[PDB]
Amino acid sequence: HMDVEEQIRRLEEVLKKNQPVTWNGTTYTDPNEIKKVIEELRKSM
């Protein structure tokens, strides 16, 4: 539970479907903004 892959796949679920997700600070409505967060997490690996 210090894994980034679980966080990425969580947002991949939302990205594939194109739905609004709350990331515990900001609700990224657009899958563009969701994927941007995936890119921030991607920089960890």
JSON list of C-alpha atoms in Angstrom, two decimals, residues 3-44:
[
{"chain": "A", "resi": 3, "resn": "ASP", "atom": "CA", "xyz": [2.41, 0.94, -4.48]},
{"chain": "A", "resi": 4, "resn": "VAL", "atom": "CA", "xyz": [1.86, 3.36, -7.36]},
{"chain": "A", "resi": 5, "resn": "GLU", "atom": "CA", "xyz": [0.48, 0.61, -9.72]},
{"chain": "A", "resi": 6, "resn": "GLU", "atom": "CA", "xyz": [-2.72, 0.32, -7.56]},
{"chain": "A", "resi": 7, "resn": "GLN", "atom": "CA", "xyz": [-3.25, 4.13, -7.86]},
{"chain": "A", "resi": 8, "resn": "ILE", "atom": "CA", "xyz": [-2.59, 4.10, -11.63]},
{"chain": "A", "resi": 9, "resn": "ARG", "atom": "CA", "xyz": [-5.00, 1.15, -12.31]},
{"chain": "A", "resi": 10, "resn": "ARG", "atom": "CA", "xyz": [-7.63, 2.88, -10.07]},
{"chain": "A", "resi": 11, "resn": "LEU", "atom": "CA", "xyz": [-7.51, 5.91, -12.42]},
{"chain": "A", "resi": 12, "resn": "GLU", "atom": "CA", "xyz": [-7.19, 3.56, -15.50]},
{"chain": "A", "resi": 13, "resn": "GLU", "atom": "CA", "xyz": [-10.63, 2.15, -14.53]},
{"chain": "A", "resi": 14, "resn": "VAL", "atom": "CA", "xyz": [-12.01, 5.73, -14.58]},
{"chain": "A", "resi": 15, "resn": "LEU", "atom": "CA", "xyz": [-9.97, 6.76, -17.70]},
{"chain": "A", "resi": 16, "resn": "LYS", "atom": "CA", "xyz": [-11.25, 3.82, -19.82]},
{"chain": "A", "resi": 17, "resn": "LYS", "atom": "CA", "xyz": [-14.90, 4.58, -18.88]},
{"chain": "A", "resi": 18, "resn": "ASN", "atom": "CA", "xyz": [-14.45, 8.43, -19.04]},
{"chain": "A", "resi": 19, "resn": "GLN", "atom": "CA", "xyz": [-16.14, 9.35, -15.67]},
{"chain": "A", "resi": 20, "resn": "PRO", "atom": "CA", "xyz": [-15.58, 12.15, -12.97]},
{"chain": "A", "resi": 21, "resn": "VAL", "atom": "CA", "xyz": [-13.29, 10.90, -10.08]},
{"chain": "A", "resi": 22, "resn": "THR", "atom": "CA", "xyz": [-12.40, 12.56, -6.73]},
{"chain": "A", "resi": 23, "resn": "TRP", "atom": "CA", "xyz": [-8.64, 12.05, -6.04]},
{"chain": "A", "resi": 24, "resn": "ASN", "atom": "CA", "xyz": [-9.09, 13.18, -2.34]},
{"chain": "A", "resi": 25, "resn": "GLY", "atom": "CA", "xyz": [-8.40, 16.90, -3.00]},
{"chain": "A", "resi": 26, "resn": "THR", "atom": "CA", "xyz": [-9.77, 17.62, -6.52]},
{"chain": "A", "resi": 27, "resn": "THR", "atom": "CA", "xyz": [-12.59, 15.99, -8.58]},
{"chain": "A", "resi": 28, "resn": "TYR", "atom": "CA", "xyz": [-11.04, 15.49, -12.07]},
{"chain": "A", "resi": 29, "resn": "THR", "atom": "CA", "xyz": [-14.12, 15.43, -14.36]},
{"chain": "A", "resi": 30, "resn": "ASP", "atom": "CA", "xyz": [-12.33, 15.26, -17.76]},
{"chain": "A", "resi": 31, "resn": "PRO", "atom": "CA", "xyz": [-10.35, 11.98, -18.54]},
{"chain": "A", "resi": 32, "resn": "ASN", "atom": "CA", "xyz": [-7.63, 14.44, -19.76]},
{"chain": "A", "resi": 33, "resn": "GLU", "atom": "CA", "xyz": [-7.23, 15.74, -16.16]},
{"chain": "A", "resi": 34, "resn": "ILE", "atom": "CA", "xyz": [-7.51, 12.15, -14.77]},
{"chain": "A", "resi": 35, "resn": "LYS", "atom": "CA", "xyz": [-4.76, 10.90, -17.15]},
{"chain": "A", "resi": 36, "resn": "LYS", "atom": "CA", "xyz": [-2.63, 13.94, -16.12]},
{"chain": "A", "resi": 37, "resn": "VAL", "atom": "CA", "xyz": [-2.68, 12.54, -12.52]},
{"chain": "A", "resi": 38, "resn": "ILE", "atom": "CA", "xyz": [-1.75, 9.07, -13.95]},
{"chain": "A", "resi": 39, "resn": "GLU", "atom": "CA", "xyz": [1.26, 10.83, -15.62]},
{"chain": "A", "resi": 40, "resn": "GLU", "atom": "CA", "xyz": [2.27, 12.36, -12.21]},
{"chain": "A", "resi": 41, "resn": "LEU", "atom": "CA", "xyz": [2.10, 8.82, -10.69]},
{"chain": "A", "resi": 42, "resn": "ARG", "atom": "CA", "xyz": [3.93, 7.46, -13.80]},
{"chain": "A", "resi": 43, "resn": "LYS", "atom": "CA", "xyz": [6.94, 9.67, -12.85]},
{"chain": "A", "resi": 44, "resn": "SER", "atom": "CA", "xyz": [7.25, 7.54, -9.64]}
]
